[PDB]
Amino acid sequence: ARPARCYRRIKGPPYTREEYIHGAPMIQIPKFDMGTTSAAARAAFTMVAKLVAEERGQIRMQALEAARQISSKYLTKYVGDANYYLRLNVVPHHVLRENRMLAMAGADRLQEGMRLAFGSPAGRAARVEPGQVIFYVEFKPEHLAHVKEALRRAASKLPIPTRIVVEPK
Amino acid sequence: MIVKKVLDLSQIPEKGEIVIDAEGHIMGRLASYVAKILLSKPELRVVVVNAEKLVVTGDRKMVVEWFMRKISEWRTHYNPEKAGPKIPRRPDRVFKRVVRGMLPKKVESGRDALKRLRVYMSIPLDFIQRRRLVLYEVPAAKLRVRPLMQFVTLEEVWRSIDPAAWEKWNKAKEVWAKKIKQA
Amino acid sequence: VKVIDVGRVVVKVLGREAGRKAVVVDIVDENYVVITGPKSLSGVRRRRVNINHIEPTDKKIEIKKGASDEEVLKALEAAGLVEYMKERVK
Amino acid sequence: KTVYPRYAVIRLRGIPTTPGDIAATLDLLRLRRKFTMVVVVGSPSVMGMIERVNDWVTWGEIDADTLAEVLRKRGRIVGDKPLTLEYLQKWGWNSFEEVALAYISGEIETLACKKDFKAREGQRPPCIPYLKPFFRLHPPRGGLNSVKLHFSVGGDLGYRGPLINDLIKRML
RNA sequence: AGGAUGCCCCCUCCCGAAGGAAACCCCGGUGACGGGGGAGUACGAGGGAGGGGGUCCAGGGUCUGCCCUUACGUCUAGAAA
RNA sequence: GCGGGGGCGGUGGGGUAAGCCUCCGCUCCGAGACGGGAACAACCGAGACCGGGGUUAAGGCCCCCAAGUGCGGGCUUAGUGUCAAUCUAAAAGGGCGUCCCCCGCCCAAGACAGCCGAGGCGGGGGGCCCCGAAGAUGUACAGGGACUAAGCCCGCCGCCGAGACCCCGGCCCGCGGGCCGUUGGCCCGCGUGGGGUAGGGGGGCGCGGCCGUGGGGCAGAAGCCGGGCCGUGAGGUCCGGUGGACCCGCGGCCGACGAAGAUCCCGGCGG
Ligand SMILES: [Mg+2]
Ligand SMILES: [Mg+2]
Ligand SMILES: [Mg+2]
Ligand SMILES: [Mg+2]
Ligand SMILES: [Mg+2]
Ligand SMILES: [Mg+2]
Ligand SMILES: [Mg+2]
Ligand SMILES: [Mg+2]
Ligand SMILES: [Mg+2]
Ligand SMILES: [Mg+2]
Ligand SMILES: [Mg+2]
Ligand SMILES: [Mg+2]
Ligand SMILES: [Mg+2]
Ligand SMILES: [Mg+2]
Ligand SMILES: [Mg+2]
Ligand SMILES: [Mg+2]
Ligand SMILES: [Mg+2]
Ligand SMILES: [Mg+2]
Ligand SMILES: [Mg+2]
Ligand SMILES: [Mg+2]
């Protein structure tokens, strides 16, 4: 897997319609809403933390999942799943392409160089704008320090700069 | 005797020679004035005395390491006496190199202007035994002393990069100081 | 190190009224003070002045902060600097 | 029926490298050389044209007194000859100020007569016959502020208000 | 074979495009500076007249000082290459 | 001519990216002088007939280098940095290092740190700087000198500075008009007239001969060496030396008709 800097910049149109894309990769994110998702339970919480993007860019699906585990594991063992709701707000609809000489990947991949340079599907990413909310945490005001620490941990696994915004519901 | 005066940048004499006391002046800022004087008066000669009292602003370690790199890491791999640089260390020759840097390069105008300059450490005895030594200052080139400000004289720089050469000159000052004090 | 004090007599070194004596009557900040001739005496209008644009003389007079031109005028009678303040430098 | 404002437009930027559409409008406004000045009437069609060439010219409301000196100092007739008082009096205009006031006040609609104007006898024409419809100004004394920035940000270009007369005084 | 009815210096006078000060007085700004007057003035490319002095002037060779300056022909989008 | 290219804009579409490939538009280079950019086709200013004077553009005003060691306020201690791009750079992250804005709480003198009697504690953000930050010929590189401002931020004042714009003189051009017995010449008017490769159009100079016309030459023709004058120029013409028999002006016509180059050909002669 190439460095994420190869796929950070938004350089072309979105590539999402999977009826026209051959071999479009499946989304390997198992869960998007962590904690207590039921609306009756979330009325206990009263504070909202948002990990907001600062630059527009593309976040790979593996980077989204990596930030998801480190943040959710920390809130699991420092806050308890019954004391928070954590949602990954974005979905990686954009399909990433790569142009490399490979195995049986179609007949036109055997031609080296920039001839027939349209790449094959190499992953998925989310295209985000500035101010877009990446992670959404509903929580109670006593655990504000822990939720910031978990969100700061998730920020360390993301390719673009992000800032934490804390506001009440 | 020695009469201190302030140099009139507009009333600069055209003929003869002026003497500038460099004590308390900034090296780059005084060199800028000296270079323009020698260019604007093609027949006038300039003498700078007390060249070791010139001042460079900044931390002593920073300035000394700057000079150390010049006299250590700047060299050539061809014939050194034919093609390489020859870096001065003495405060009078250090100041004369700054004025050469501020003069025009590879021209007779630059060559003649530097020949019309003489730089001395302390004050020469034949200058001291004249009837009336008219010295000058350039207040724009003078250094305004402020608390917690960093600078070093050229003499302190010379003692760092050539202590044995400095020691002989300092000893020579003490040897003749009785005679110098008479005048 | 330059000292400007209230009641100190200074000479302007910039502007139209350069070479004219004036009297410090108040301090605005650490950069600006208030000077006055008085006008009828030197021609220095009662404005503020930058400390970089005035040089202090060796004379002084005693007055209150924000002293009036007539108040400045009387204390010039106190030390008799009326002819001194009329002088122009250079 | 409507007396639109009378504006002065001066070309501040040059010919080489100007975009094509801005260049086309400047030609139609007769500003075909640098520092050329034209006097127009601020009709809605006129003001749309000046908006097109906003980043290449400066403009403002011209006063009657400034136009009078502009006519005397830089007015030219066919053959590039200077505009004199005698030529004005031969056509029914007593003074430079009188002809400048009439155009600024709206008493006459154009300053220079058209190509197709037919000179009459006795009747005073509503313009100056055979005056060139452009002025060639001097570069401004004391310089400018910025020829690449707008007047509203401390530059030169754009709508200047009544300060166009001060610039015209510096450009005569 | 060119001018020497020349050329340069000084002086004097006159006209003079675009342009255009200074001292000094007054108004303003902390100030760099702006404005009224001085003043469209002194001056100003060039165009006329005269007086005195000198002797060659134009032109050429070579050198020096200051300013400017990247052999030629060619293909090329692009040549000092 | 049917090889284009530069800058900017369409996240153009593609590509990890490319001084990359392929489209769309304005402008510029090719085929465009000149000022600034340290050099530099296409970045900024600007469009050049010749000479002169003046004023400005971009940009600059400590020296190199014309013009300011210009003005007020603040920040930086790192020589950090040293007025856009080409062009020599810097990220995530850490720092109350330092200057500043804001918010929450305690202190109602019983606040914090160890009775004392004035502020204290914590949070977010902003500016600059430090760490992160490693290279191959020669110095704190990005012009050099050097500078603690001659750096950076908010504002300001004047000046320098092109061939551009203004003015004067001279020249040529396009078009219109007029005059002259005219394969043409001359004069006047007007032109926000005056760059130019390939190419198209219009006029002239030279060389050898021919048809005419007029001349020169042993008191010295052609040729050769140097020089003056005329013409924007191709060129013409004259003077002095050498030479020893041919040659030239004007009108017309015709060509085996113009060289700096072809690893050009022949000869001669060099380092
Ligand atoms: Mg793209
Ligand atoms: Mg050694
Ligand atoms: Mg030697
Ligand atoms: Mg441009
Ligand atoms: Mg003769
Ligand atoms: Mg080739
Ligand atoms: Mg090629
Ligand atoms: Mg070539
Ligand atoms: Mg093609
Ligand atoms: Mg293109
Ligand atoms: Mg080509
Ligand atoms: Mg340049
Ligand atoms: Mg200079
Ligand atoms: Mg540095
Ligand atoms: Mg990066
Ligand atoms: Mg042409
Ligand atoms: Mg013939
Ligand atoms: Mg050829
Ligand atoms: Mg041969
Ligand atoms: Mg040989």
The pair of three-digit structure tokens given for residue C62, joined into one six-digit string: 């005693």
Say which amino acid occupies D150.
H
Beta strands in A10-161 (DSSP E): 33-35, 47-53, 57-60, 84-88, 94-98, 120-128, 133-139
Give me the CA D69–C1' E32 separation in Å, rounded. 33
Distance between CA A111 and CA A114 in Å, rounded?
A: 8
Q: Write out the two tokens for B110.
A: 């630059």
Taking the CA of residue B181 and the C1' sugar atom of nucleotide F214, their distance in angstroms comes to 105
Instruction: List chains touching D (3+ CB pairs under 8 A).
Output: none
Q: Which two tokens stand for residue B63?
A: 């300035």
Exposure class string for C10-39: b at 16+ Cβ within 10 A, else e: bbbeeeebeebbbbbbbbeeeebbbbbbbe
Give yes or no for a contact between D146 and D154, defined as CB atoms under 8 angstroms apart.
Answer: yes
Q: Nearest Cα to B47, choosing from B122, B139, B156?
A: B122
CA distances to A10, A49, A79 from A135, rounded to whole Å, are 21, 8, 17
DSSP class of residue D159 equals: E
Instruction: Kindly tell me the sign of the dihedral angle through the C-alpha atoms of B12, B14, B15, B21.
Output: positive
Structure tokens at D18: 């100007």
Nearest nucleotide (CA of C14 to C1'): E31
Task: Identify whether the C-beta of residue C21 lies closer than 8 Å to the C-beta of residue C74.
Answer: no
**Measured CA distances, A154 to A30, A68, A73, D147 (Å):** 17, 7, 11, 50
- Nearest nt to the CA of B71 via C1' is F139
CA D46 to C1' F164 (Å) is: 28
Runs of H (alpha helix) within chain D: 20-28, 44-52, 64-74, 85-90, 96-105, 164-170
The backbone region for D109, taken as left when phi is positive above 0, alpha when psi lies in -120 to 50, beta otherwise, is alpha
Residues bordering ligand 1, an ion, CB closer than 5 Å: A 11-12
Is D49 within 8 Å of D152 (Cβ atoms)? Answer: no
Per DSSP, helices labelled H in A43-165 are 61-78, 144-155
Q: Name the residues in B100-159 having a C-beta closer than 7 Å to nucleic acid strand F.
A: 101-105, 109, 140-141, 143-144, 149-150
CA distances from B124 to A4, B47, B120, B127 (A): 71, 11, 7, 5
Q: Which chains touch C (3 or more CB pairs under 8 A)?
A: none
Residue B61 CA to residue C20 CA, distance in Å, equals 47
CA dist B66 and B57 (Å) reads 12
Q: How far is the CA of B75 from the centre of ligand 14 (A)?
A: 22
Q: Which nucleotide is nearest to B66 (CA to C1')?
A: F140
Give me the residues near ligand 4 (ion), CB cutoff below 5 Å: D 17
Which DSSP helix (H) or strand (E) runs through C58? strand C54-60
Residue A11: CB partners within 8 Å, gap ≥ 6? none
The answer to whether the beta carbons of residues D124 and D92 sit under 8 Å apart is yes
Our measurement of CA D16 to C1' F48, in angstroms, reads 13
Contact A160, A132 (CB under 8 A): no
CB atoms within 10 A of CB D57: 27
Q: CA of A35 and C1' of F153: distance in angstroms? A: 49
d(CA B49, CA B23): 8
Cβ pair D160, D60 in contact under 8 A: yes
Those residues whose C-beta lies under 8 Å from the C-beta of residue B178, and which sit 6 or more positions away, are none
CB A51 within 8 A of CB A147: no
* CA angle, A73 then A78 then A82, to 5°: 85
Method: cryo-EM
Residue B121 near residue B92, CB atoms below 8 Å: yes
d(CA B123, CA C39): 50
Give the position of tokens 């007779």.
Answer: B108
Tell me the C-alpha to C-alpha distance, in Å, between residue B149 and each of B30, B57, B145, B152, B157.
Answer: 19, 8, 7, 10, 17
Residue type, B126: D
> Is the distance from CB of C90 to CB of C19 less than 8 angstroms?
yes
The gap between A33 CA and F166 C1' (Å) is 77
CA angle B105/B109/B114 to nearest 5° reads 80
The alpha carbon of B140 and the centre of ligand 14 are apart by a number of angstroms equal to 26
Report phi then psi at B123, rounded to 5.
Answer: -120, 130
Cα–ligand 11 centroid distance for D24 (angstroms): 30
Helix (H, G, I), strand (E, B) or coil at B75: coil
Instruction: Report resolution in angstroms.
Output: 2.5
Q: What is the C-alpha to C-alpha distance for residues D161 and D34, in angstroms, rounded to an integer?
A: 21
